[PDB]
């Protein structure tokens with residue numbers, strides 16, 4: 001591929017000297033100084049110059065496209081030369097001379113997103129970032145750490161400069177690298193000392209431009225580029241580094257640009273993993289440890305020992321994938337500073353990869369909790385958080401209805417589990433209806449005397465539970481709330497009913513008619529592949545086995561999932577907590593092949 005370049009005005013009065021950068025098309029201006037007694041002209045040049053005439057004799061028409069290209073870089077100032085002869089009907093040929101110096105200036109980065117640095121002449125448009133498997137544009141990682149060995153540069157992105165210039169070339173020219181003032185505080189560029197040093201920063205905050213010290217001849221030099229900021233409401237995520245060839249041969253007059261070239265980087269966004277992604281490591285923080293260590297063993301997963309205050313995502317580039325931990329206080333780590341109840345990672349779930357009326361979301365979609373309309377007594381997730389998730393684009397957030405809950409988190413009535421059929425997964429929704437249907441079937445058999453809350457200090461019987469008309473209307477209202485979100489999830493994730501499974505769950509209203517788990521919230525389980533760690537419901541025991549555990553096994557076990565009910569899954573801080581996170585394998589799908 002070849003891009004446009006410079007215009008050269010030739011004149012028969014004085015000879016003309018010019019630089020040409022291999023890879024650019026140079027047009028020629030012949031008429032602006034052509035003699036008046038002349039009607040035609042001819043072209044003759046050095047074997048290294050390629051001439052091209054559009055629209056070997058040619059007339060002096062103003063609209064003739066004369067263009068030159070260079071076969072190879074010069075060895076001396078003025079290697080290749082071009083000679084314009086102007087002749088006429090009775091005029092001896094009048095020559096105009098042009099001394100050209102060819103020079104290679106290739107600024108290469110991993111434009112093709114293949115993990116190999118390719119030159120800008122291998123892409124049509126280098127000054128543009130295009131999504132998708134056919135697009136162009138390199139990728140940067142954010143520095144997430146609160147002399148430089150090779151180990152520090154393994155995260156950074158390579159950018160090379162290849163020059164091939166006459167020996168004396170940078171006596172009269174200089175090359176400068178620069179970043180736009182507005183993007184400078186979001187990047188940092190290191191110059192490879194060949195291996196770099198902590199004081200080799202050429203570009204970065206408070207330093208937008210830098211004069212390269214390049215010697216004549218054939219020379220290649222390496223740069224390492226890290227990014228300093230994720231995409232955000234005020235940062236779309238693009239950083240364009242440009243290199244400019246300046247002409248400094250006149251000492252009195254300012255520098256003159258003869259050439260620019262640029263590469264465009266996109267900062268890789270922060271990406272979250274749905275419960276369908278295979279687990280790599282379980283972090284936990286007391287007899288429930290044995291139940292989760294068994295789980296971890298059976299699912300062939302690692303278990304380290306020591307919550308909803310942090311979330312473990314990743315950032316990905318063709319050369320590296322690093323997992324980044326986000327923490328909202330109240331390798332790779334990032335924090336946030338101010339505070340509403342819905343500003344918790346507990347209010348942040350991720351669908352599995354999905355396709356919605358044509359549009360494909362191969363990294364899933366982020367679900368977060370919200371009110372249904374803004375009221376004086378309504379909570380919402382802080383705007384700055386909503387926007388930051390939207391700014392990473394690749395997991396197009398979806399606004400659900402969770403304000404009806406006392407704490408307000410979607411993960412209280414929502415969860416996904418892997419499945420071996422249909423779209424490969426299943427939606428789990430808490431369901432008061434499914435619980436009431438089960439408890440009535442148990443009363444229809446004479447077991448209404450069975451007691452819930454068995455194993456704990458006060459219990460209750462199925463008879464008194466099933467007949468409480470105050471509680472029935474509570475769960476009828478809750479059932480409406482969850483149903484709203486159900487029609488929303490069917491629309492934005494494009495689900496059929498056959499993709500949704502109702503886990504029986506009872507609720508109770510508390511302060512301000514806000515909802516809360518009646519018994520331990522079993523939809524909020526611990527998904528580790530085909531092995532589920534479910535909160536022990538302590539339901540009524542019929543035939544020595546909990547009848548609630550019986551239902552959930554009858555629902556999940558046919559998917560191939562191994563149900564293990566954990567006794568002390570949640571802990572009360574005289575607030576409700578669970579001490580478990582899960583790092584999961586990042587998506588095999590490369591986020592840059594998406595088209596948001």
Ligand SMILES: COc1cc(C(=O)N2CC[C@@H](O)[C@@H](N)C2)cc2nc(-c3cc4cccnc4n3CC3CC3)n(C)c12
Pocket residue numbers: 308346347406407409411412453456516517518519520521524570571572576577578
């Ligand atoms: C708001 O109340 C809750 C939230 C969540 C949840 O899913 N959570 C936790 C909060 C946030 O972190 C969410 N993101 C995730 C789970 C809950 N289970 C119960 C529960 C009910 C029950 C009945 C008898 C004995 N024990 C019982 N328990 C368990 C015991 C702590 C009290 N309650 C009351 C829960």
Ligand SMILES: Cc1c(C)n(-c2ccc(Br)cc2)c2ncnc(N3CCC([C@H](N)C(=O)N4CCCC4)CC3)c12
Pocket residue numbers: 142143144228229230231232326327328334335336342343344345346347348384385388
């Ligand atoms: C950190 C963070 C978090 C946990 N959350 C969040 C999201 C969802 C929930 Br639920 C709870 C919290 C944010 N939301 C909105 N802005 C956030 N910042 C992202 C970082 C950005 C900073 N300049 C940067 O890029 N750095 C700093 C170190 C190197 C890279 C500034 C804005 C965050």
